[PDB]
Ligand binder design. Structure first.
Ligand code: HEM
Ligand code: NA
Length: 248
């Protein structure tokens, strides 16, 4: 239901060049997971009823970074500032979604379609809209479904974003990678979810909720069995997420 806005040729040129520089920067710095977190976690403040929040660069604001659920994201914002300064024409909104798209690509993930044109919004959304790692399927549906307007399929596919990276005890309080290959985007997050708790690896209560739900569970099984089907559903979900409140 998207109608993407027109941007100038010079805008499109900056996106292409930013995309390449982001690949190099993110690969070298080994920060694909934190970048994916910044893009996705920050898009997830969207509330469809009121058309507030969402992927509009408000996460740059010290006020939104201060939200306890955003512990560590100030690192991400700080890391990107010098590169962003090379592309003054790009909104921060687009730049952070581009960094998320690139984070998935450089780690071996699918090519998520990207459309420019998000505008930087003045006011952060209220604290507390983010998914709670201690809660379950009802909470996931409240947040991704009722607020964001995403599907049950989207929920499971997006949870697979945890196939890269780790929790940190000084950030959320949780600790460790979800997989044995935390810089590799693949279906191992679902493989690990099915095989039970392996020593050294993390499952959040939000991750575990996927196994006990009658709708979520077939999706976990499908993705564990079929990485291509994961990659397809994932690219679809991530595009939608990055586009919440944008072009409709
Ligand atoms: C489903 C609801 C979600 C919950 C409850 C959740 C919760 C969390 C928590 C608690 C952390 C750890 C923060 C830390 O201690 O460093 C984390 C990290 C992460 N999240 Fe999520 N998240 C969710 C959705 C998503 C989505 C939709 C994506 C992107 C598709 C995503 C991508 C990531 C990545 C890549 C990391 C690792 C960051 C790093 O390595 O520093 N998450 N998540
Ligand atoms: Na992995």
């Amino acid at each position: 239901g998207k109608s993407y806005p027109t941007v100038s040729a010079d805008y499109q040129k900056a996106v292409e060049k930013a995309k390449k520089k982001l690949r190099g920067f993110i690969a070298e710095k080994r920060c694909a997971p934190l970048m994916l977190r910044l893009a996705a976690h920050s898009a997830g403040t969207f509330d469809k009823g009121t058309k507030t929040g969402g992927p509009f660069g408000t996460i740059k604001h010290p006020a939104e970074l201060a939200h306890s659920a955003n512990n560590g994201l100030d690192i991400a914002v700080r890391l990107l500032e010098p590169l962003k300064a090379e592309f003054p024409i790009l909104s921060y909104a687009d730049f952070y979604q581009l960094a998320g798209v690139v984070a998935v690509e450089v780690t071996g993930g699918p090519e998520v379609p990207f459309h420019p044109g998000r505008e930087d919004k003045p006011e952060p959304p209220p604290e507390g809209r983010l998914p709670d790692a201690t809660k379950g399927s009802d909470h996931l549906r409240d947040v991704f479904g009722k607020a964001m307007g995403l599907t049950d399929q989207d929920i499971v596919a997006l949870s697979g974003g945890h196939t890269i990276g780790a929790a940190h005890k000084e950030r959320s309080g949780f600790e460790g990678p979800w997989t044995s290959n935390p810089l590799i985007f693949d279906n191992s997050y679902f493989t690990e979810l099915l095989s039970g708790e392996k020593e050294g690896l993390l499952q959040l209560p939000s991750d575990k909720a996927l196994l006990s739900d009658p709708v979520f569970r077939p999706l976990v099984d499908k993705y564990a069995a079929d990485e291509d089907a994961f990659f397809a559903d994932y690219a679809e979900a991530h595009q939608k997420l990055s586009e919440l409140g944008f072009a409709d």
